[PDB]
Each structure stands twice: as structure tokens, then as C-alpha cells.
Amino acid sequence: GKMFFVDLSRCTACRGCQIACKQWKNLPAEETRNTGSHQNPPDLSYVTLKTVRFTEKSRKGPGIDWLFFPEQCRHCVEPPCKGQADVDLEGAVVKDETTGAVLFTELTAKVDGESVRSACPYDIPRIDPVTKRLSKCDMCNDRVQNGLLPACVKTCPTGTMNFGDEQEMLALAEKRLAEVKKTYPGAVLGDPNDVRVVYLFTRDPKDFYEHAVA
Amino acid sequence: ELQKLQWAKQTTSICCYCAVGCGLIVHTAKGRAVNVEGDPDHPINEGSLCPKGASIFQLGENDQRGTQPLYRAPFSDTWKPVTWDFALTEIAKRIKKTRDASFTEKNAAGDLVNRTEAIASFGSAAMDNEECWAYGNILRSLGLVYIEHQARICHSPTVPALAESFGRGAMTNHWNDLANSDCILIMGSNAAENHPIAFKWVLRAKDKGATLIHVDPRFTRTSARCDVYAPIRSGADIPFLGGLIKYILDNKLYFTDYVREYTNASLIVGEKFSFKDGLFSGYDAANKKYDKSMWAFELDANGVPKRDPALKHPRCVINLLKKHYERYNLDKVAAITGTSKEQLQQVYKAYAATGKPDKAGTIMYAMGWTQHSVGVQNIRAMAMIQLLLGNIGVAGGGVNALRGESNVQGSTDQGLLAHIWPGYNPVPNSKAATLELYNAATPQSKDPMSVNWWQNRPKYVASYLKALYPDEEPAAAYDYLPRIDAGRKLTDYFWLNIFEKMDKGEFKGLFAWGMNPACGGANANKNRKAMGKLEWLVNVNLFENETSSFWKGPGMNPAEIGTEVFFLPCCVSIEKEGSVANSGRWMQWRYRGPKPYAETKPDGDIMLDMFKKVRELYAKEGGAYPAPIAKLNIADWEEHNEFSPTKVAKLMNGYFLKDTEVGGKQFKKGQQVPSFAFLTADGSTCSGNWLHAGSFTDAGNLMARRDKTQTPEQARIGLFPNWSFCWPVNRRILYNRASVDKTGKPWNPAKAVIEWKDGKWVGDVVDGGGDPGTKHPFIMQTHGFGALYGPGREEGPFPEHYEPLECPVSKNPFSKQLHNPVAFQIEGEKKAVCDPRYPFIGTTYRVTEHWQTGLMTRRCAWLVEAEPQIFCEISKELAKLRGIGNGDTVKVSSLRGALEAVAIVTERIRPFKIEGVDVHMVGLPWHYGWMVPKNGGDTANLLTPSAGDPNTGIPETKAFMVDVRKV
Ligand SMILES: Nc1nc2c(c(=O)[nH]1)N[C@H]1C(S)=C(S)[C@@H](COP(=O)(O)OP(=O)(O)OC[C@H]3O[C@@H](n4cnc5c(=O)[nH]c(N)nc54)[C@H](O)[C@@H]3O)O[C@H]1N2
Ligand SMILES: Nc1nc2c(c(=O)[nH]1)N[C@H]1C(S)=C(S)[C@@H](COP(=O)(O)OP(=O)(O)OC[C@H]3O[C@@H](n4cnc5c(=O)[nH]c(N)nc54)[C@H](O)[C@@H]3O)O[C@H]1N2
Ligand code: SF4
Ligand code: SF4
Numbered sequence A: 001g002k003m004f005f006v007d008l009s010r011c012t013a014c015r016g017c018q019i020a021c022k023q024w025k026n027l028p029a030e031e032t033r034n035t036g037s038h039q040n041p042p043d044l045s046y047v048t049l050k051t052v053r054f055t056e057k058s059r060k061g062p063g064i065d066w067l068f069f070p071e072q073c074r075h076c077v078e079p080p081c082k083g084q085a086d087v088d089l090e091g092a093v094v095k096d097e098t099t100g101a102v103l104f105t106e107l108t109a110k111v112d113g114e115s116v117r118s119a120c121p122y123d124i125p126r127i128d129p130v131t132k133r134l135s136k137c138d139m140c141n142d143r144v145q146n147g148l149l150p151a152c153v154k155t156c157p158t159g160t161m162n163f164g165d166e167q168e169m170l171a172l173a174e175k176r177l178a179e180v181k182k183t184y185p186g187a188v189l190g191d192p193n194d195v196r197v198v199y200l201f202t203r204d205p206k207d208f209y210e211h212a213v214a
Numbered sequence B: 001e002l003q004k005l006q007w008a009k010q011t012t013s014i015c016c017y018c019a020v021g022c023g024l025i026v027h028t029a030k031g032r033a034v035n036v037e038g039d040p041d042h043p044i045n046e047g048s049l050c051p052k053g054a055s056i057f058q059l060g061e062n063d064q065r066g067t068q069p070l071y072r073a074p075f076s077d078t079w080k081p082v083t084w085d086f087a088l089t090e091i092a093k094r095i096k097k098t099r100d101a102s103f104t105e106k107n108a109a110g111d112l113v114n115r116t117e118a119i120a121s122f123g124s125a126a127m128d129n130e131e132c133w134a135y136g137n138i139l140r141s142l143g144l145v146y147i148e149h150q151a152r153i154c155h156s157p158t159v160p161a162l163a164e165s166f167g168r169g170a171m172t173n174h175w176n177d178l179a180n181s182d183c184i185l186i187m188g189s190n191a192a193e194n195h196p197i198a199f200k201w202v203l204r205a206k207d208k209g210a211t212l213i214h215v216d217p218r219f220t221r222t223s224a225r226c227d228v229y230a231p232i233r234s235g236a237d238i239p240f241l242g243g244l245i246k247y248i249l250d251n252k253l254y255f256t257d258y259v260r261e262y263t264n265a266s267l268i269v270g271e272k273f274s275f276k277d278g279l280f281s282g283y284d285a286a287n288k289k290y291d292k293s294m295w296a297f298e299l300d301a302n303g304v305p306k307r308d309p310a311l312k313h314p315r316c317v318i319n320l321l322k323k324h325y326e327r328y329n330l331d332k333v334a335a336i337t338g339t340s341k342e343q344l345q346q347v348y349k350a351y352a353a354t355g356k357p358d359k360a361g362t363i364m365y366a367m368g369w370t371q372h373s374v375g376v377q378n379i380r381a382m383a384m385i386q387l388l389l390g391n392i393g394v395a396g397g398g399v400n401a402l403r404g405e406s407n408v409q410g411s412t413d414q415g416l417l418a419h420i421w422p423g424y425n426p427v428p429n430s431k432a433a434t435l436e437l438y439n440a441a442t443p444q445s446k447d448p449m450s451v452n453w454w455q456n457r458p459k460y461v462a463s464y465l466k467a468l469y470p471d472e473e474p475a476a477a478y479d480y481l482p483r484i485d486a487g488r489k490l491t492d493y494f495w496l497n498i499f500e501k502m503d504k505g506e507f508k509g510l511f512a513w514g515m516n517p518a519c520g521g522a523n524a525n526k527n528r529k530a531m532g533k534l535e536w537l538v539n540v541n542l543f544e545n546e547t548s549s550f551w552k553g554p555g556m557n558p559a560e561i562g563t564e565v566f567f568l569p570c571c572v573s574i575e576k577e578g579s580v581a582n583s584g585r586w587m588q589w590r591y592r593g594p595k596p597y598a599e600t601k602p603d604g605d606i607m608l609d610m611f612k613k614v615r616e617l618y619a620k621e622g623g624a625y626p627a628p629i630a631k632l633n634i635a636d637w638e639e640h641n642e643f644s645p646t647k648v649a650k651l652m653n654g655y656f657l658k659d660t661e662v663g664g665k666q667f668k669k670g671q672q673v674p675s676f677a678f679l680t681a682d683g684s685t686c687s688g689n690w691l692h693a694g695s696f697t698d699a700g701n702l703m704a705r706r707d708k709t710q711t712p713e714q715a716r717i718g719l720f721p722n723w724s725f726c727w728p729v730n731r732r733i734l735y736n737r738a739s740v741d742k743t744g745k746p747w748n749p750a751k752a753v754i755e756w757k758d759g760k761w762v763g764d765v766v767d768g769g770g771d772p773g774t775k776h777p778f779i780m781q782t783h784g785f786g787a788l789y790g791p792g793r794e795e796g797p798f799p800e801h802y803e804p805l806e807c808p809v810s811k812n813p814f815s816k817q818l819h820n821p822v823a824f825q826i827e828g829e830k831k832a833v834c835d836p837r838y839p840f841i842g843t844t845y846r847v848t849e850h851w852q853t854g855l856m857t858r859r860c861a862w863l864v865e866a867e868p869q870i871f872c873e874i875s876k877e878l879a880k881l882r883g884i885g886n887g888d889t890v891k892v893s894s895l896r897g898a899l900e901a902v903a904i905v906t907e908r909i910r911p912f913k914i915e916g917v918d919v920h921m922v923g924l925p926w927h928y929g930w931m932v933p934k935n936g937g938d939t940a941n942l943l944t945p946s947a948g949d950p951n952t953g954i955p956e957t958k959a960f961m962v963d964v965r966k967v
């Protein structure tokens, strides 16, 4: 299958990935207001499959630790979202055996949306309040099957976003972690044996987001 | 197959936003664009786009965009959709009428000037290079002198600052080259937000061991990815930089052989040079100016400045340099900057380490340094530091002045500023009565090692006049173009004074052509009012905007406004063919993906049809001095009754008007000039811009080259010399003769820019021909040296600390002079100097997601989504002191205006410890305007002062004083 390696030690929170996701899919914009943060939209929703979370952690001396988390479906190797959806109706959540993408169909409207969301260790699923369809990151599965990089991976200027085969990315993840530790000694990989979106965090993953890791 | 791209045509383009110059691919319905994303084959972005580039589809296929031109009759409340034919004929009449009435053949002194002072023009760096040049020549053929654009209020200080220092005003290296640096100082720049793809190359520098340093008032998205962050108070840069000069000299961290051979360290300054208590010699208090002749070098009998190569003479530049910056000790710099003495030493140690010959330090700076009353002197200081450390001419070194708009480099190159023609040939003054007198101003050198390349200017001015008037002798055609008055300061003809004059009714007609001065001009209230006193405003833009609709903004009434506002809706970058010059001078060709939207067209087609109707009107009717208009070589711009970017680009490069022999080589009539080296003064050659000579040759369009193939030597520094074309003559790194010793051996063989062997230079194109050690390495300098001492600048030959015109301190600790003694101010206008009403430092800056005034990005739902409203960044300490909560509505006020913003209370801003007292700042974005979106807010330029730099007249938009209060 395929794998993302997301090196957050290189992320400038440019939100190129946030706009690139919506441009490729032609998703609508949410109604937003500034409430004392650059973060917007403030959460994932039916129409927002990726938002960059901003967290400020106080530090000894000048400046802060500013932690950026471009959040998406981890496309789990054994997705608990599918396990729960399959209780109600098989074909609401399906898996691509070639890429490893975990895909929500419009049948999600006819399963317990609340249960499927609660089944996610990463709190990723979002429900359309009108149609009750579940929406999230689909890994740009169509682009990947047509030999293109996902829109958020191609757009990323810093080298934060990396994509390819499992073996290639796990190797890259292990090699990069060793180099990053020389600058960020508290660097760790997020649930590297369970998911296909492997984040490298510069410190406590939970400082990035409460559901950053399981 | 991907459904979305299945029925669409794939073309290449260049991003219409920042001067990184990222490659796009536009998928076009076989006919509107269906997709826009990055070009994976582009050597700068490698397919990457920031959120502005990634959203160009939402801009290009936007439903709020201008269909067909609108006409506002005077005193009216609404538009009326007119045709192309109505719009261009009526305007061509309005120009002609206003010109005929106010055209001045001779000035008050009785000198020929042949100009119109009743018409001004603003814009634009957003236009293609071909269109920018066409526009300038059209305005000048109409006799305009008041021709300005973005550059004035952006990097205008960079040009004289670096020209004084190195001999050219441009970014010395390029984006790819940053990866070669051993220490990247980011100061007066937020490169991770404002040049996002640049951080691809900054992080690759860090991968190979480079230390990343951000020095900024605020902790930003840039600061998050740097090894060292240090705060600095807005307007306190010279203290910091003067501190680093002293540090380098005391600790002997300078590159001795580089300094002695390649800088003016050894030159002897005349006895008439002195500096005491913040004033240099020759100060004229009554006229707010200096007698620069007091700063002249001691000359030998041949007129060559005297040198002491042992650097022992007390009036040697290096010894006068040591003496000036001895007052810049760590204790005083700490006291005035707010930067801790520990962090000064940390940053000083880290950067001065690159003084080592095989180590390269680079500076990345933009508006943080330029937008000051000491803008030129800020940049001079860093240029002087780079010369001391030998960082100029080397890979991973140089002064990386980060240009703003996609083609602001180009638009400056095409002379859309009041003081320059294309190619930085100055606009004649009233005392330049003949072309010979014009050329006589160019300083000569009797040093046999000084190339002094500007001595070739007569060939460029003659070839330029041939491009415009090919049937006239240059000496004859010279009389057609208008001239400014020799008696005045240059700053009388620049942005801020153009708006003061407009606010006195001295202008009839403004062209707001691809600019939004209602939001982009400093002191915006003044500008919005002043614009009421135009008899006709023309506006060429993508959307209806605050400028084109000033007549109804916060308190504007068509009850008392009489401006015939014309609105000409233009194409977007992806609907147009042409070139754009990026920050590294890379001139990149882009193609039409989609056809134009709703019967709208390119600026080139607009301005050519518009002017053609003037040319026709003057052929029928009479009118004042019609010779400049009738005779303009315009048929060389055209192919099929429309603007030909391809032909206009070939004219700029230039071709032989007859059969000629130049540089011991035979050329045939009609064929292209292969480089500016082969231009002539006798009328044998035309060339719209001598810098473009070599861009479009007989070999074809070199700007259109998409060749990433390199030699080993080129590949290990990422020159990409076969990708597009950069001026001058494909020299990717300026001043590269300084990268080698006097035998031609690189200081940094691992990262060599040029190398000597087979009796030729290998790698980058050598910046100045000649065998090793036979020429001084700065060929555009008169004397040929990197200028530590630069006596051409308005406020002295060394940078000296002066507080902003609105400052939070009452006493300069470096002198008795608080402010810049010759600073550009307007008589009457108020300044809060430690005013109790405005006790906080005011500064304005950008976020990643919005572009300029936001005119473009406030129409794009995905960018509004991310950054929907104007905000106000303040510390926790200031939030505490004023009882402001995170997210609360705050009112920010200055002497010139006030606005409402959402408070972002953050540890990313902290108090500045200035003279043992904690000074608080208020940060604002300037991306917002009253028109769109709902609750978005207005421009931060309501607060900004209409005063600043005496060299270039740039407003002080980065350091003023404000009050913030909860609502
Ligand atoms: N996202 C985005 N990118 C852009 C643009 C845009 O609008 N949005 N516009 C383009 C244009 S036209 C330009 S010219 C460039 C400009 O790009 P930048 O120069 O990066 O723009 P700013 O954010 O205005 O200023 C940079 C930093 O200067 C700091 N600063 C403020 N006052 C001072 C001071 O006195 N000293 C120092 N040392 N720093 C200070 C601010 O805190 C800010 O972080 O960006 C270009 N790219
Ligand atoms: N307080 C404060 N004020 C500032 C600054 C600051 O840092 N602080 N920054 C200053 C700087 S660096 C700059 S560059 C200026 C910029 O100020 P302006 O140039 O007035 O800014 P905009 O008009 O928003 O941006 C350029 C315009 O180009 C238009 N455009 C795009 N494509 C085309 C095209 O093909 N043709 C035409 N004709 N127009 C086109 C866009 O619609 C947009 O309106 O603002 C300055 N103002
Ligand atoms: S595009 Fe890359 S650098 Fe920008 S926010 Fe997304 S992951 Fe971070
Ligand atoms: S992250 Fe959540 S929604 Fe995505 S595959 Fe895993 S369990 Fe399912």
C-alpha cells in the first residue's frame, strides 16, 4: 500500500495543503470569523477535510514553541471506522487493497454516524447535518491510482509532506527522525505501525493536538 | 484517467503573486480553466504552491470579477456597462484635452521640459514586462513626469542602497542559491509567510549544516522553523547592524584579503569629511540637505581616489569606519533595540563566523528594513557587513533583497518611477539641454582596473531613443521625452508629494492602473479625499475595488464628488502571454491557458487601443506638441490588430536598424542584438531596455527556455543557467569576480560560482570580462570597489541611528539628533513623538493567505476562510495593562485615523526593554478594505504617516505610534 510521511519539523503553517485540498475537490468555503487565532476553519467539518491547527506553548526565554498540525484521516491499516460502519451496513466504508486508502461512500448516511466517529481514535469523521453523510480525507485516491501525488503533498514547499510505498516511507521516516533529533531531541513518529499518515512531531504529539496520536 | 483534467488543455504559467516566480500548470477546457496547480518541472517550486498560488483557479474563475468596462459619470451613484469602443475613444479624448491645456514647452527658468504636470499614473508591478515598458513609453510620449508604481513604497530604498554599495540595485543572488548558505539571517523579512517556496531552499541550507536566524519584533511562522529567534524594536535596525560592524572589527572577524582588494577600505577620504553628534559635515539646516562635496575622496593627479593598501592612513575608509561604529557597544545597542546583550552576542557570533573565506552568510530582508525614514541606511549597514565578511559575489552569500510582486523587478527595470527611464538611465532634468549634456553626467574613471561599465550608457540611451523613434536621430528624438526641474528634490515627483499635490487640486487625471492606492497608499484618509479633486480617474483592475469606488467609502457622498471614474476590467495572468522578472532577475515566459473572461482583455491590448485612438485624434485635430505621439514606433508592438508580447519583447532586446560592425564582428540589418555589448550610440542599434539585450536573440526566446540541465560546477550551487534568462547577460550571481582570488581560484572551491581555466571562466557567466586580477570586481561602480563608505546617499556616507518620525523615546543615545536630519516630511502634518495619546509602537505586515490590499484575495473564499477579518496582535503584558481579552474588539488609533480589529493576544509579542523601560507595540495587517468581505474591516494605512526616506520618499509604514483601546 501507500504511505504519507509528514515531517512537522519543516512545517511553516503556510496552509498551502489546506487550500490545495479544497481546490482539487472544488469544496465550498466555511463561514468563519477571527476569535483571537490564525487557525481557521477552527475544526474539520463536512466541507473541510484538512485544517492546520495552531498551538502556542510557552518556552524558557524569547519566542515560543509554535506547533502546526495539518490534520487528516490517518487511513489506518486496520480502520476501526470500517469495523463500526460494517455493523450497520457493509459498503458504507470500504478499503482500496492496492493503495490502502480507507474510503467513505454516501451509504454512510444510512449507518450510525456518531458511532463511526467515536470508533475513530483520531476523531476524524465529520457528519453532514442535512444528508447525514460522513466526509474526510480520501487520500486523493483517484490521483494516486492515476500515478499523481495527493494535492496536499504536491503543493507543500518545505518537504513536510512526503508520499510513496509503505517500505520507502517507513525507511524515510526512520532516517529523517535520526537527523531531526539533532535539532529536536524530543522528536517522535505518530503510531508508525498502525497508520498510513505517519507524522513526525518535534515534541509531545499531544501539544500539537489532543487526538494527534491514539 | 482523472475526470477533471480529461477534456482540458495543459499549458505552463508563472504565479501572479510574489517574486519567488513559482511555475504553474493550467488545465483549460478544450474554454475556461478547470484546474490550476504547481509545475513539477520548475526548478524553484518543484510543483509546490503556497495558499495564494494554490487558489489562482478561484481568482481566474471568480464571479465577482469585472465583466465589460463600467462608466461612472460625475456625481453619479452607480456604474453603466459601456463597450471597449466607447471607453477607449472617450478616455483618448480626456487625455488629449487635459494634456493640451497644461502642457509646458519650457519651465520658469526658460529650459525645455515638454511635459504635462496635470496627469499622474500609479502602476503596476502586476503587469507583464512587455506591458510595463509599453505603458511607461505611452505615458512619457504623452509628456508625463509623475509616473510611479509599487516599487516607490516597497524596495525603492534597495536600489540606491545597493547601487551605492555594489553598483546595481537588484537582489545579488537568487532563491535556489540560498541552499548553499552556512548562515541565513532573516531580518526585516517574514520569508516563511511572504516568500513561502523560499523556505524549500532555506531548510535545504539547514539540512547541510546552516544556522537559521530570524530577527523580528514578532515571533512568526518563520521564527518557528529557525535555530535562533531574537526580538528587535521597529526602527532599531541600524543600532543592531552598527553593533555587528564594531563586533566584526574589534574581534577581527572581517575577511582581510577581500576587504583590502575588493572593498574601498583602502581609499583616502578628504579632510572635509567629519561627523559629530549625529551630523556629518556640510549640513544645510535651512534647506534640510547636505553638501555631499564635503564627503569626496582624496584624488591622485589622474583623478583616481588615493589608496593606502596597508590600511594605515588615518583617513582610510576602514579606519573612519572603526571610528564611526565605536559608539555601537553591546550595552547601548541592547538599551535601544530591546534585544538582550546575550542574544546580540549569540547572533553576532553565529553570523560573523561566515567572515571565514570558505563559509557564506546571506541576509534575507524586505519591507521590515525598506519602509523607514532610514530605509537606505538600514540596507547600507547590512551591505557594509557583507563586504566586511566577504559574502558578496559568493554562493550562499550576497544581499537577498526579496522583491514583492511577480514583476516588480521588471516594472522597476521598465522605469515606472519618476526618476528613471528603462534600464536605470535617469529621466533628464531641465539642465540636460542636449543628449551630449545628458551623457556628460556619467562619471569617468582613469583607473586601468576599473571597468566602469556605465561609460557605455550613451549606446543604451541612443538605442532606447531608436526603439521609440527609429526614423529620428537620437539627439533629435531626445527633445520628445519630458524633463523634471533640476532645481527640486527628486522626492517632489514621488508618491507622497503626488498625493499632497492631488490634495491641493494640482492634478486633473489619475491612472490607478493595477494598484489600489485607497488602501495601498500610506495615510489612506488623505488619499481617499484628495482623489475627489480629480476631473477623471482611470482604473485598470480585475475587480471593482476601494480605489475605483472611493466616492462612497466611510463618509464619501456623490453629493460633493465630480470624478468621471472609468473602470477597464483586465485579464488575469493565466489568460495572458508575456514575461515576468522574479526577485533573482529570472525573466520567465508564460502562455495563455484560458481565453479572456467576459469580453475583458490584457493591459497591452487596452493601452495600445487606447493610445492608438490618441494617435488618430492628433492626426485629425490640432493640439500641443504632437510630435512625441505621432512618431512612436508602435507597429513593432503588433501582430493581428492586438498587443504582441513576442514582438515587444524582441524590441526590448533590440535589433540592428542597418548593417553594422561591432566588437570585431559583422552583423546584418534586421537581426536581433545578441547582448548589450553589441549596442551602439550612432543609431545602428535599437533596444527598448539594454538589460533585455540577450533575452530574445536570433537563437530564439531565452526567457521561454525550460532546461534544468547543468554542468557539475553549476549543479553544486543550483545556477540553472539554461532555465529562462536573467539580466545581466545570464549572470545568475552578481559581482561573482569577488568569489575568486586575484589568480581566479574560488575562496569556496566546494561551492564555486566561477573558476578560471582554458583561458576562460567556467560556471556562472563572469560579471565583467577580463583575465584574473586585471579588473576590480564591481564593474558598475565608478571606482570598481564595494563601498563601505558611500558618499552618494542623502543623510551621509555611513549609516547612523535616527528614531522613527513617530518614536517611543525622547533622546537618541548615539547623538543629539533624534530623527533623520534630512527626512522627507510634508509641512504642517503632525507626528506623535512620545505623545501620551499614542504611547505604543505601530507596525503593519502581511499574513501568508492574503495579497497586498487584499483586493484580489478578499474575493477568494478559501483565503477569507483562513483569514476572514483584520486583527490586532499584542503581548500578554499590553493586553493586561489595557484590560484586553483574546478575541475582543479593539480600536487602534493614530493622529491620522482609527479602525476596529479582533485582538490576537499572544506570547509571540513581548515588551521592548528600551532604556530600562518596557515599550509595547501594536501589530496590524494591511490586507483589509471597507468593500469586501462582510465584517472584514478597513485598511491599516488609515493609521500610517505620509513621511519617510529622503533618498526615495518611501513612507514609514513599519514604525509609527498608535493607541489601542477595548470597545
Ligand atoms: N503572503 C504574502 N506574501 C507577499 C505579499 C503579501 O501581501 N502576502 N506581498 C509581497 C510584497 S509586495 C512584498 S514587498 C513582500 C514583503 O515581504 P515582508 O517584508 O516579509 O513583509 P512584511 O510582513 O510587511 O514585513 C516582514 C516583517 O517585518 C517585521 N518588521 C516590522 N517592523 C520592523 C522593523 O522596524 N525592523 C525589522 N527588522 N523588522 C520589522 C514584521 O514583524 C514582519 O514580520 O512580500 C511579498 N509577498
Ligand atoms: N501599511 C503598509 N502599507 C503598505 C505596505 C506595508 O507593508 N504596510 N506595503 C507596500 C508595498 S511593498 C506595496 S507593493 C504596495 C502595494 O499596493 P497596491 O499595488 O496598491 O496593492 P494591490 O492593488 O492590492 O495589489 C496590486 C494590484 O494588481 C492587480 N492586478 C493583478 N493582476 C493584474 C493585471 O494583469 N493587470 C492589472 N492592471 N492589475 C492587475 C490586483 O487586482 C491588485 O489590485 O502597498 C504598500 N503598502
Ligand atoms: S503545505 Fe506543507 S508547510 Fe504548508 S502548512 Fe501544509 S504541511 Fe505545512
Ligand atoms: S483515522 Fe479514523 S476515519 Fe480515518 S481510517 Fe482511521 S479510524 Fe477511519
Ligand code: SF4
Residues within 6 Å of the ligand: A020, A021, A022, A024, A049, A050, A072, A136, A137, A138, A139, A140, A150, A151, A152, A153
Ligand atoms: S490527501 Fe487529498 S483529500 Fe486528503 S488532505 Fe490531502 S488533498 Fe485533501
Ligand code: SF4
Residues within 6 Å of the ligand: B015, B016, B017, B018, B019, B020, B021, B022, B045, B048, B049, B050, B051, B052, B053, B054, B195, B196, B197, B198
Ligand atoms: S505566492 Fe510566491 S511562493 Fe506562493 S506560489 Fe506564488 S510565487 Fe510561489
Ligand SMILES: [S]
Residues within 6 Å of the ligand: B125, B150, B151, B154, B155, B403, B404, B405, B408
Ligand atoms: S512590491
Ligand SMILES: [W+6]
Residues within 6 Å of the ligand: B150, B153, B154, B155, B403, B404, B405, B408
Ligand atoms: W511590495
